Amino acid sequence: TFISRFAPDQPRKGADILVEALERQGVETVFAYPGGASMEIHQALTRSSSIRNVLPRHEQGGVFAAEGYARSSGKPGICIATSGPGATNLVSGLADALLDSVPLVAITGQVPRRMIGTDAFQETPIVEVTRSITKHNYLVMDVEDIPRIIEEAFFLATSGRPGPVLVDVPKDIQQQLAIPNWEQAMRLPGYMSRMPKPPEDSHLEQIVRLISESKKPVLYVGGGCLNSSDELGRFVELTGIPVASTLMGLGSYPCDDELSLHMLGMHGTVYANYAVEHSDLLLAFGVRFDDRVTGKLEAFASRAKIVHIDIDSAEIGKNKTPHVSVCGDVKLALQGMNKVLENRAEELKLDFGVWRNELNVQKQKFPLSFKTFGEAIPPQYAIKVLDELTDGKAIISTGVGQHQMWAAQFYNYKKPRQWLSSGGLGAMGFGLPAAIGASVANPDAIVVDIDGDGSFIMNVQELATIRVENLPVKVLLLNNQHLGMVMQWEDRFYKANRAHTFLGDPAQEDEIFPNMLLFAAACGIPAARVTKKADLREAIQTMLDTPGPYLLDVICPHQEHVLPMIPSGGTFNDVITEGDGR
Amino acid sequence: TFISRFAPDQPRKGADILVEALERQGVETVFAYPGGASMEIHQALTRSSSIRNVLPRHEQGGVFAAEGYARSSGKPGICIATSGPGATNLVSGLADALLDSVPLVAITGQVPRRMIGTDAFQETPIVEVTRSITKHNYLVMDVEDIPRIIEEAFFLATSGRPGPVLVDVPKDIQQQLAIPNWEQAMRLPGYMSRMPKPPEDSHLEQIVRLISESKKPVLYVGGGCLNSSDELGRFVELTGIPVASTLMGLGSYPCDDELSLHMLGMHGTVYANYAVEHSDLLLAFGVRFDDRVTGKLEAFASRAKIVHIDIDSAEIGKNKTPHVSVCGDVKLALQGMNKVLENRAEELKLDFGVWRNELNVQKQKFPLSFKTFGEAIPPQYAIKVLDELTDGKAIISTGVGQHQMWAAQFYNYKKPRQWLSSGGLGAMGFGLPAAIGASVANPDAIVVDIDGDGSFIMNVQELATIRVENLPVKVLLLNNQHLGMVMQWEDRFYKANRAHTFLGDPAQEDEIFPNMLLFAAACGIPAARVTKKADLREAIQTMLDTPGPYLLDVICPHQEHVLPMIPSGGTFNDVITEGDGR
Amino acid sequence: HTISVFVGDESGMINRIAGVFARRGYNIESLAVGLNRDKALFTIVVCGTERVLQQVIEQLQKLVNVLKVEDISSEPQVERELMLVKVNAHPESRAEIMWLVDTFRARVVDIAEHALTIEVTGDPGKMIAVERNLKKFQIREIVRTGKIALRREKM
Amino acid sequence: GLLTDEDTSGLRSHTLSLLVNDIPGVLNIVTGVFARRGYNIQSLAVGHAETKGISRITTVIPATDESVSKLVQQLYKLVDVHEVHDLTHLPFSERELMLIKIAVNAAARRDVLDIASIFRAKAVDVSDHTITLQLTGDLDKMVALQRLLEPYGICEVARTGRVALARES
Amino acid sequence: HTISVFVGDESGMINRIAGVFARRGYNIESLAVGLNRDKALFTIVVCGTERVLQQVIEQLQKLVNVLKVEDISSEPQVERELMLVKVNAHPESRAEIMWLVDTFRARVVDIAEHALTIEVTGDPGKMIAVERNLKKFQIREIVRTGKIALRREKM
Numbered sequence A, B: 001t002f003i004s005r006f007a008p009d010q011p012r013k014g015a016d017i018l019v020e021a022l023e024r025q026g027v028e029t030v031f032a033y034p035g036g037a038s039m040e041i042h043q044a045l046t047r048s049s050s051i052r053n054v055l056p057r058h059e060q061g062g063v064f065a066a067e068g069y070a071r072s073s074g075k076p077g078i079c080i081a082t083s084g085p086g087a088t089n090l091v092s093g094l095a096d097a098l099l100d101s102v103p104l105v106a107i108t109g110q111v112p113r114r115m116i117g118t119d120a121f122q123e124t125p126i127v128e129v130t131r132s133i134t135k136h137n138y139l140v141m142d143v144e145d146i147p148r149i150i151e152e153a154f155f156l157a158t159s160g161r162p163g164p165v166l167v168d169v170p171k172d173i174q175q176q177l178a179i180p181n182w183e184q185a186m187r188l189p190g191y192m193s194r195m196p197k198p199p200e201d202s203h204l205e206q207i208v209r210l211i212s213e214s215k216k217p218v219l220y221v222g223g224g225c226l227n228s229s230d231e232l233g234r235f236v237e238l239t240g241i242p243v244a245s246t247l248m249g250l251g252s253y254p255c256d257d258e259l260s261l262h263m264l265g266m267h268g269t270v271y272a273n274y275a276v277e278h279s280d281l282l283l284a285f286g287v288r289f290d291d292r293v294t295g296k297l298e299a300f301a302s303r304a305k306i307v308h309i310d311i312d313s314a315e316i317g318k319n320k321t322p323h324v325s326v327c328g329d330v331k332l333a334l335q336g337m338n339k340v341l342e343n344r345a346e347e348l349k350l351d352f353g354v355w356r357n358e359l360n361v362q363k364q365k366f367p368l369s370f371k372t373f374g375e376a377i378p379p380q381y382a383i384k385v386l387d388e389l390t391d392g393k394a395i396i397s398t399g400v401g402q403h404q405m406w407a408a409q410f411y412n413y414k415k416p417r418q419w420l421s422s423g424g425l426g427a428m429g430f431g432l433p434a435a436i437g438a439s440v441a442n443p444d445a446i447v448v449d450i451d452g453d454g455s456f457i458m459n460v461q462e463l464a465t466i467r468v469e470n471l472p473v474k475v476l477l478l479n480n481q482h483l484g485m486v487m488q489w490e491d492r493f494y495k496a497n498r499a500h501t502f503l504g505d506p507a508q509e510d511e512i513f514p515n516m517l518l519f520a521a522a523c524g525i526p527a528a529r530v531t532k533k534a535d536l537r538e539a540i541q542t543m544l545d546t547p548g549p550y551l552l553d554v555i556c557p558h559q560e561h562v563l564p565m566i567p568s569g570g571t572f573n574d575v576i577t578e579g580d581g582r
Numbered sequence C, E: 001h002t003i004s005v006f007v008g009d010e011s012g013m014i015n016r017i018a019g020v021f022a023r024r025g026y027n028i029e030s031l032a033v034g035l036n037r038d039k040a041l042f043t044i045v046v047c048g049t050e051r052v053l054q055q056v057i058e059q060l061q062k063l064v065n066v067l068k069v070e071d072i073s074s075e076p077q078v079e080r081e082l083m084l085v086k087v088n089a090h091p092e093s094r095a096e097i098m099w100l101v102d103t104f105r106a107r108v109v110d111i112a113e114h115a116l117t118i119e120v121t122g123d124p125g126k127m128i129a130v131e132r133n134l135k136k137f138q139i140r141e142i143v144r145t146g147k148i149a150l151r152r153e154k155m
Numbered sequence D: 001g002l003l004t005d006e007d008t009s010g011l012r013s014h015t016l017s018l019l020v021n022d023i024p025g026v027l028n029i030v031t032g033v034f035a036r037r038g039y040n041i042q043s044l045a046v047g048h049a050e051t052k053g054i055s056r057i058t059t060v061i062p063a064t065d066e067s068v069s070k071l072v073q074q075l076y077k078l079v080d081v082h083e084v085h086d087l088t089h090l091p092f093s094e095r096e097l098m099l100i101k102i103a104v105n106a107a108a109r110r111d112v113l114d115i116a117s118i119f120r121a122k123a124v125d126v127s128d129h130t131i132t133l134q135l136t137g138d139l140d141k142m143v144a145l146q147r148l149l150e151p152y153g154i155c156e157v158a159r160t161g162r163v164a165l166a167r168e169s
């Protein structure tokens, strides 16, 4: 194994076990915030020279950091917190990690066992509030359980449908003295009894046989192939089935080639919308058929047969039911699918490019275009030139809305583990601590981080935690002085009714608010206020010039709209290429 | 008579039914983080001017603003979050309001009711997440019974132990149009079976039959006297019992009269612990008898005869066994205590000068002193400085920690609800957003606030909410670059190390981190930075005349520690006598 | 539209289970469970379509402690539901509950002068009989277990 | 691993007869309290009470009555609970059906139904692969049959949990 | 608080036994005994604390003829107590004792036009039912044997 920093045959504290329990699971960093009960871990977390606790400010920013460090690793993130409020702010990132399937371990210091139940001190019943929003949770009760809990935890977080796990360790339990049997094996008979098998090979030809009766297929990748470097793109390099990602499917395919389509869906690109709806063969590959994807329940690829493959059995056909399905880890399920097609090489070409060129004539026709209004800098231009300024190696992180969308439908994400967002949840305030975790799982990557009007400010707790750790959290700001996504909701649906969608003071309308440059000066980072055409790439040039973090207040027009935006639960014909703010 | 905004027979969007039912309770301020899924309720807000949207910068800040507006008015505060991730951020403040017994109502959107819990978009099944930490939840499935549950929520917000009610509404419910059937009764059949009746004087006889039997009484008051403005002061005007006020009861007894025992318990004033651990009748008016006030359950006033008056039946006997116990709304049963005992005003005991002599010799022998090591401002002085300058009454918010009790032990409170606390939750991040809600509960009144170095930064986003709403918040930042509570929990528990207590930057530890001047100047707010006592009275002088809000930054000495602090399960024999951080 | 669940070593096994009908919004028609030190066999009927039944037989396997979920609905089952009805035992009207517990063929465990307690057992068709036929006598308090099913196993 | 285990009682083993509304999630609000009060739920059986529109949950909790008094009023803190009744310190009927499939041959099926005739177990379904009993009564007769059918080829003991009403006698 | 006594070869075996509850002043709640030519199995319930029960299980062994005393109280017993109740058999009120002997599931040995005689057998909880439930009909003469217990033996 690794080096044991502890005598392997001697009964010591739960605190001696806990940090070693992660250290016996290869953990290098936890996002631990100490507290009334979590401090006993921090008594021993300093003792782990391997696990440097990135201390957060908000544990919501901590538990968001256990997503950036998760979804830029493959290794699961760990957020440790305390009962009372520390546990009840994991529940943002836990619900983020449930919906977008982010592997995570949520250790939490719990109340002593005599004071459990009675709500004596700050006992939020954590496994009774987070029973929904985690894949599993563990109120432990004896310290000997903690190794077989945590080995099950990293089994449950990483393997299976990779979701978040919580662990409640009580304050007296961490103080209790016991024996750390790492070879106390997992007493988890339920999960491993249908922990999903490799798909059988004759079932895999049934997909390949479905390509033969589909001159119009489309590959619908989601976050399944986030564990695949080239294994998705090689399959498309093997067989000419056109890619069409979703939002967390971004990055998984290298979305910068000439075959590369983009994120499809409601705020997904319309030249990806034609490909999914005119097709015959939805290759739903590691993706869960969301409602920012289907629009209408029936009018999502109604003239298409669907293969939906996923690491979850249950997620298969949760929405409209596919035709053929394996419960395969798609990282493995491709690696038998590609096995037959290098063997069965060219007796079936499966490269009917006229269906690909049915959309390569639409690749230019309904493009990623917009209008620059005035000499002020337009919003989605700056993220567009950010990609060419960063080689596409910059792991993005973002919050939610326009600066999730304009981050999504423009940037070229080469590797996977590159698009780091709250997706199906849509936790605002994500990106600034998402890049915090992304500054640890890929700690020398150029982790630029687009934030927005509101979702920057929501978690400027963690702007402190850049300065304590000196990370390249290059915080791009797609600020437009207004929470614009719901402004984009309000005009195209209901009467443009400004329900304080403008963030700043409405008695201070024509001025920048807040002066978030001094947020960087509040800690020690430099910043940049970008307002015109005169500094498009210019401060973003100085962004990558400056080592460590940066801020780039690209203030954008106060009215802007994400194109396209289908109506909520709407038919495919109401795709648009419009913006109505000016 | 309710001023109806529209016709009583207008079939309209359910949010109109919803937002009228809020004002039909008679509320005026919501905290509504805008809705990508709760969209119509902000839209139906905008067609109202009786209700006010104080749109927070974070929903946890929003529910803490709904906490502050609740516990600085007493009117049941209303937050509104967006569905899903916004609703996960309430789970902090909902865990406060159940633990701290705060009348809260959490309206929240849900997704379309055809999409509830389907691992859908923007979804967290928060009606089932917060089942364990609210007084009630709701998942209404029709428009016609929206104000059924709303008046039931404001029933459940006001009645019993005043808890939070997360009220959810699906997005397609308010997008379904129907007529508001307003006056339907409380569909609430079980809760009327314990809707607490007024306990009559026959039940109060065995209190007042033991008042004369009481030689050594103590008035263990707390959050049940949160409505008792002068009724507790009338009770001590009748019989003269030395008080023992807890944190939500700080203010209830105006803590500047003769029996000025500020705060009791494990972190209280040591001469109020002397008042409680030496009693022969522990008289309690609305306390939850927690671990961090009692230590042991059986030794906390073991030589006493506990009586305990609560609106909550379940609290009676929960943590602490009562000798004789009587339920009932305290402020109602105190009006049925003081305004009935005047027949016994020449019969009762009043013989407590020999018990008032015990506190007087131990008032000064057990003092509230400090250590002015050089000139690094004792914050325990700086709150005695505060009531020297804040002209008496001041509505004060806190975060939690070592800077929480510095408000408690060292301010002379004059009215209940002119004081805020995350006492039971221990919610770090309470300070600045409770300053919001107090600044619309008591807007023109002095909303002063004191925060710690982390708990301010943990919810520092709500600085932008102030300038939008012109609130006169007066925040004092008791900075020590440190997790000020648990650094003492290093020393008096196990070891005088510095295990992750240091919040600041280790590259500029002598310098301020983060720069709160450039926090408030980032949001244009004026600020200050104090370290010397000569400017201490100067900065507060600049604070209470500042138009709109003001920030300041005292420097707590990072190695100053507060008496008492016992491990959980302790008595006053296990008090600490002088514990510092040096 | 009924489900049998076998679960493993945890405490509050039902809270995982009764959560993921509520948080999935799919109503349980009835439930009962024979819990033990580590084993428990739930028997849950969920009044939904076979499409949403196909979800919750697998969405309950998104839980970890579930050893096995089997939709028992398609099988020829033995739905047996106990119902300890306490009936007002007034001898003017007790005199016909005699045979009207003999018809349903149930023991009568405890009798008072105004309260007798019967033990009706079996098919929910026979149970909704008693809930209606013996409703014509004034019922003190019906308590009933949930419907329990098993495979009428042949090969 | 086929059969459900032996018995659902310890020494403490209090029984609470809940009486809740027929909310679709009303079980999870009730066992949500047993979880959040740190109680293992030893047995539970829900069902519709005498007023159609409310439910009735009969629970088994291993807790002494001091801790149960920290639960019966604590379950009152739920909204939907109309009443709880601590039946355990009263005489109470304790009837629980228990559907026991037992794989048997032909001759051993004779030497099972007689035992089922002892307990007045209506053998509700029989095959040649197996026979499925259905006995009912107190939990001691439940555990006596399972202690006596462990010699035979038992299968999925689909029990139902202790159901109770306090007798007036 | 019940005791089973096995005694040996003497006459007036009960006089040794029923003495040493009276002369020890510890009241018997009930008693019955199957005497024979040399063997007899008493079954005595003594309404006392477990401390004084510990005395009389050994103070009855201060007697000589006692072969064995076993306090059967801690065991899972089978307390079965017969009760030959003779009830007034008036057919205006006989008509419901019919099922109210079928409920307790007892034979009716001898019937007259005004006196029928039933044979209620078993648990003293069921016996105190009949002593109360059938007390609502005018009882001629209850005779009852004492409660008899045995080990529900397993290993």
Ligand SMILES: Cc1cc2nc3c(=O)[nH]c(=O)nc-3n(C[C@H](O)[C@H](O)[C@H](O)COP(=O)(O)OP(=O)(O)OC[C@H]3O[C@@H](n4cnc5c(N)ncnc54)[C@H](O)[C@@H]3O)c2cc1C
Residues within 6 Å of the ligand: A099, A100, A101, A161, A162, A222, A223, A224, A225, A227, A245, A246, A247, A248, A249, A263, A264, A265, A266, A267, A268, A285, A286, A287, A288, A289, A290, A292, A293, A309, A310, A311, A312, A315, A328, A329, A330, A331, A400, A401, A404, A422, A423, A424, A425, A426, A485, B036, B121, B122
């Ligand atoms: C305001 C807003 C607007 C949005 N607009 C859009 C839009 O227009 N178009 C769009 O596509 N999205 C949009 N999204 C994102 C959307 O909400 C979902 O997050 C998106 O569908 C993410 O893809 P996915 O959830 O289907 O795949 P995932 O994020 O991966 O969700 C997990 C599912 O994929 C499968 N999976 C995970 N891991 C594996 C594995 N190892 N092997 C196999 N399968 C695996 C999981 O099992 C599960 O099925 C928007 C989000 C927001 C907040």
Ligand SMILES: Cc1cc2nc3c(=O)[nH]c(=O)nc-3n(C[C@H](O)[C@H](O)[C@H](O)COP(=O)(O)OP(=O)(O)OC[C@H]3O[C@@H](n4cnc5c(N)ncnc54)[C@H](O)[C@@H]3O)c2cc1C
Residues within 6 Å of the ligand: B099, B100, B101, B160, B161, B162, B221, B222, B223, B224, B225, B226, B227, B245, B246, B247, B248, B249, B263, B264, B265, B266, B267, B268, B285, B286, B287, B288, B289, B290, B292, B293, B309, B310, B311, B312, B315, B328, B329, B330, B331, B400, B401, B422, B423, B424, B425, B426, B485
């Ligand atoms: C680190 C830390 C240390 C602390 N140390 C101490 C300490 O040493 N000493 C101390 O006293 N506090 C201390 N506190 C604060 C303590 O946690 C809470 O203040 C206390 O547990 C709750 O206050 P309460 O019980 O008096 O009233 P609450 O619990 O807030 O409510 C009053 C209680 O009585 C009843 N009640 C509620 N509403 C009404 C009503 N309208 N009418 C009648 N009755 C009602 C309710 O059941 C309620 O439980 C500490 C907090 C922290 C975070």
Ligand SMILES: Cc1ncc(C[n+]2csc(CCOP(=O)(O)OP(=O)(O)O)c2C)c(N)n1
Residues within 6 Å of the ligand: A399, A400, A401, A402, A403, A404, A425, A426, A427, A428, A429, A451, A452, A453, A454, A455, A456, A478, A479, A480, A482, A483, A484, A485, A486, B033, B034, B035, B036, B037, B059, B082, B085, B086, B087, B089, B122
């Ligand atoms: C925690 C949370 N709050 C609110 C929402 C709803 N929501 C999604 S996007 C959006 C607009 C805010 O985006 P912003 O940070 O202001 O930058 P923008 O995208 O508007 O340019 C809102 C209010 C959400 N998904 N999550």
Ligand SMILES: Cc1ncc(C[n+]2csc(CCOP(=O)(O)OP(=O)(O)O)c2C)c(N)n1
Residues within 6 Å of the ligand: A033, A034, A035, A036, A059, A082, A084, A085, A086, B399, B400, B401, B402, B403, B404, B425, B426, B427, B428, B451, B452, B453, B454, B455, B456, B478, B479, B480, B482, B483, B484, B485, B486, B556
């Ligand atoms: C998120 C969270 N973490 C930990 C705790 C426990 N806790 C409360 S206060 C505190 C340290 C106090 O720091 P601060 O609130 O900034 O005020 P200070 O005492 O330092 O002046 C800790 C560790 C908590 N309530 N919430």
Ligand SMILES: [Mg+2]
Residues within 6 Å of the ligand: A401, A452, A453, A454, A455, A479, A480, A481, A482, A483, A484, A485
């Ligand atoms: Mg914005």
Ligand SMILES: [Mg+2]
Residues within 6 Å of the ligand: B401, B403, B451, B452, B453, B454, B455, B478, B479, B480, B482, B484
């Ligand atoms: Mg602080």
